[PDB]
Amino acid sequence: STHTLLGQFFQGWGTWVASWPLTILVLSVIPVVALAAGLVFTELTTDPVELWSAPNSQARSEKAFHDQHFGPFFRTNQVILTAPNRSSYRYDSLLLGPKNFSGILDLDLLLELLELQERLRHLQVWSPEAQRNISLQDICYAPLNPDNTSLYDCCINSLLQYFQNNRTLLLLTANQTLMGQTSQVDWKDHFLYCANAPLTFKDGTALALSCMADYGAPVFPFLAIGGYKGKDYSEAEALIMTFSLNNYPAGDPRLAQAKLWEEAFLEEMRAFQRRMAGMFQVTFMAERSLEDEINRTTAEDLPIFATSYIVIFLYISLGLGGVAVVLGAVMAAMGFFSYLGIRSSLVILQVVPFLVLSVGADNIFIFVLEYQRLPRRPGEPREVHIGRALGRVAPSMLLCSLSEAICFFLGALTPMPAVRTFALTSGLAVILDFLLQMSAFVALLSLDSKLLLGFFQKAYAPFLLHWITRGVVLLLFLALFGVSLYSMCHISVGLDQELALPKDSYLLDYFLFLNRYFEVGAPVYFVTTLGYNFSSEAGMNAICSSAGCNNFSFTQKIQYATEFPEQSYLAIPASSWVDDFIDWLTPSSCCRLYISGPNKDKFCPSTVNSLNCLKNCMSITMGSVRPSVEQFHKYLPWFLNDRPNIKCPKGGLAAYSTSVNLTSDGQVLASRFMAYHKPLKNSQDYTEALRAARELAANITADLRKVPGTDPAFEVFPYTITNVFYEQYLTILPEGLFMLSLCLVPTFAVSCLLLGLDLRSGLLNLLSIVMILVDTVGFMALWGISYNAVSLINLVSAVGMSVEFVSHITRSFAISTKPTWLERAKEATISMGSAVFAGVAMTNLPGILVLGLAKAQLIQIFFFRLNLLITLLGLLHGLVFLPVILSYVGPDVNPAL
Template identity: 35%
Template sequence: PTPEEKASCYVGSLTCWTFGIYISYSILLFGAIVYFHRFYNSQKFDREGFERVALTDDDEDTLLDPERSSRRYALNALLQDYFYQQGYICAKYPWQTIGVAALIVSFATLGCSKFEVETDPVRLWVAPNSDSAIQKEFFDQNFGPFYRTQQIFISSKNTSQSVVNYNNLKSLFIIEREIREIKSPHTLQDLCFHPNGDACIVQSVTGYWQSDLDNFSEETWRDEFISCTSAPTFCLPDFQQPLKPDMILGGFENDEYTNAKAFVLTYVLNNSLNKSETYASQEWEKSLREYLNKLIHNENSKVNTSQLDISFSTESSLEIELNKSTNTDIYTIALSYLVMFVYASFALGSFTSLPRIFIDSKFLLGISGIIIVLASVSTSVGIFSILGIKVTLIIAEVIPFLVLAVGVDNIFILNHEFERLTLKSFGEESVEERIAKTLGRMGPSILLSALSETIAFGLGGIVTMPAVRNFALYAALAVWVDFSLQVTVFVAFLSLDAKRQEENRIDCFPCVNIRAPGRIDKEGLLQKWMRKYYAPFILNKKVRIAVIVFFISAFMFALGLVPQIELGLDQRIALPSDSYLIDYFNDLDKYFRIGPPVYFVAKDLNVTTKEGQQTLCGRFST
């Protein structure tokens, strides 16, 4: 940040904002503790002489049973009635429900035929209607896009030593010669920017000797180097542009160029808005990357790079490396879905006896839950692909995990409530009735949860940054479709699975019927632990106060650190941890002293007239 943006008010090492937040919260917390302590003591005095009456087991069950709630709200009652009817219909006609949903999902998924991934960093992070994007578009249309830049940093592995010596400079000459000879089938000479004759713009320290090893002498190189870095205009390269030391050397101090820690090589290629015209440049850049990777691993017989560190970036490197990250994450996504499927299959089942393991397991139900999650993602992708909203790397990597987490939660909620009702009814109610009651009780909370998540993501759709906006839209639709399928299709699968269990049919082979003892419906260990131990503990008065204080304290602590949040997007964060570009960006920050160019473009101005020249140049134009 600029000096004007830095906080000027400090109390010790803390900013005034952080100090004020912490002091204010400490005072409020101390006051609250004193108040509640006095209030509790007064209440304790008022209760003296009264004896607590222990609840019977029946009373305890009544308090824990959601059916015996003493209050009933109009909205909740309306939603319960609606979901009761929906659950009954889906359970009574399961195959019809699954068939209709499959047709809708299949039709929406057809939109994936227009699936496109946006990988251009500019189009991802810059709003198309922002001033920067509009001005860049105008510049590109009138002057052409900025040149394709290839940059290489060469430094010594011993960071305390200067890279400027005879052997390293000689190796640099050889490296540049081999780069000029790269064919893809095009050469550097075919693709480079050469404004002055046929000489390519190559910004390198070898330009002081016109990039010709014959001009480089072991006896005189040091004096020539010192002379050229002091007066670059007397040592012009082939393309006749003075080479400032700041552009070709890095890691030096106080103009002591002989102590530089890095050579900086910059190749400038022509660029075009026509993608077909840039294909040749991309092919040459691919060959350049292959050559440089061999140098990094010291696999070049003509140059010994064992004592050199080399980092580089081509114009197409960033986009390629980001795509590489997405391709490797596919295996992670697949593995996470597999693990969640196995976990859900075991956790959804209730194994009451050894002979009923193959009946009470719920692998098919777990598969159906995972398929629903995948269907919601594919539906969202298909619909937005039809609308022309491209997928971004964030969408491909995050949304599958996001929808999986949300979807699996609701699956467990519905299954647990159904098991609870089955345990309570002792087989007196039909499967359809139990399914209807399950959805009637859990449906309103699942609806409100999904609605709040959808609205939260949907609000992100008003953000102008394309990467954030597209992610928010895809996530909002995927979450809502996931909810819709859970309260219809999963309910239908739950009904089919319950009927299969009652008829003693094997889980993964539902057509096979086996003899097995009757099911022993009893409360699971986890449910019993939650009811007898965790719930009483977390609802204890002192524990509740401690939990509230802890989370409020954590929030206030984080709020106090808000001024330390740094704005911006470091490109290294989005790259794979093993990407060669990370070394390049590290060297760029460490060694390169030149920032990006700035252009001032004047619209609707005729510079061939005196008035236009005076408008542009002010008093310097006569």
């Protein structure tokens, strides 16, 4: 008899608390201030976007490997222009004939872009470190000269670097004759040539200009122009400007002083946008922007949510004290984790009370209603009266605040750190609410000494409980179940990137141009783990692509997967370094040795010419030349220090200077192979591209481990900058369904174990909760709400919350001792359904009056838009179905003396 013992215990507890209310109130209000001091002490928040990745997941372990061996990924800042007013026209270029250009490639706009680019290059900002005024050379990603980066060696990708940013070279007209000349060649004839082959040093036109940038590296067309899918390289609808800044770990001061340059870059481009509006639509984005704009919306709406926990006060209209009790409990639970050490963000800190308070106030309302509705046996004071009232309401009030702490704690197994912190914070707020609304609230309820609901509940009852009503409500809700369980399959898993922003930020314009005008997605690298030999003649051929090497190979596998971009999510070949290194070892003035030079007997660089150096590295021509082992360690570092000029453009440190990590002897440890994704638009494309690249990587490693000298536990994994975000969605269906399905067991095993309910009433309770979950999943899929990590903690919270909808109804039916089932549930409805309705409306009205006007996309889609569905879909299953279903398959009469 576990139910009877709890009532006796809580009745004696309530009588003693009524006896000593002042002392219990002071001694239970004093241990809240100590826990609340943890908030004011530090409460360290987590600003950046590394609160959305599992700290030991495989996708972040690969990032920790790559970041260690090759340095971190470069931060990118972009500007897109896309002039829409001008008209496409015609140009009869002498080489390729007719070409019908677009309006953005007119010469009147390129100069105006150049005067913005060369002024963004010379930008200086004052830092918190007051000594040094920061230039761009300190924090720029220079792939050719990192030792002392001059200001002209920083990576500034744009179309203007086909002319090396030279104004006079851009304004150049040259006579050229093929005997049918009829014109002079202008800059566009040179741009059309450089688009086809970016590696050329001497242009094939009459005017000669290299297609290489100011820093000695080629610039590809997809990094410069976009929106050119048909009619290639002629009808670009948008220019592109890109600045690359090298990234550091979070503790380094250079990252602190490189986020201050991007702020001035944004504040200068925002002035550039309004300086000209009749000829451009410039949209920009810095890497600082996204992680410091989703915090702005959350930090600009705390006063607009302060009406939430004051509109909690007005709906009860002894009530101020209860809301103060729940707010103190939630604040203490919020501040307790600072002592243990948990870096929670302000976004987590803003929505915790507005989901715990909606469950913490209903128990107060139920207790005060049962205290003010009791028969009030005379001959005894209130000191036993409140204990007598609390004895038969304590266990039912204990189920609904213990079947939510269990649900929230069980829901804290999600991979995301911030969702885990939100679950852990609200899992202890409610459990520190139930312990503090009897040790403090009962003292106030004894210390206070010094309608119409039951009107129309008895008219709402004849609307139900009749065969007109009891035979249509059942099949209608079963049809709702039948439509929801087949609409569940249309649900879409994945969280879009644009839902973190408001409806008015410039990043929405940037993403709308990025999804529509780019032609290559983010780059990806096929990293090679430690172990591969890379030296044997039978070792290079498995990673080769040309001149005698094998039929199928790694850099041949990537190129073959490029040709079906719809299935494999790649759009550019691999560009391996062994393929370029074998080309560089070909003779004729690339790799040469001094013969009679005692002082420089090893290397003759390409730029030096004389009659001294004449011997080649590779000895004699032969079919499919490949170096020996001893010729590898000599000749590989030299290839990583030969800048490409026009005497040997075969390769060098232009693109491979940080793609191989040499040891202290000459055995390579790891490598990278850079290939570009196809244009990825929504969040169902990122995860699918991740899976379709990872399976290709596993195919490559399974093919590559067959060589003789290799080592097992050697895998070639893919890595891109956003792999650490969308890696969870491969495995959120099995780990999401399992967490929900295991979450019903501790509620079913306790709701039928606390208050009667042997099998049938608890079974109907489980049927109601499963119906609520399937209906809310179907309506969530039908609205457009996604199914991600942040939209699963809400469903777990609804599973915890629905015990409110059902437990009091099944309680009042079980205690009912009236004769027939046709009217036995009427007393239970009139007794408890009104109180449950008031409790549900207690979350319904403040659940809509604040979170529906949040102005953030995250709160407006995942907390107002979804909690409203659960709240007004649990009313229909708790006030229209459950009493009706209990009148047909309801248990027989319990005496229950």
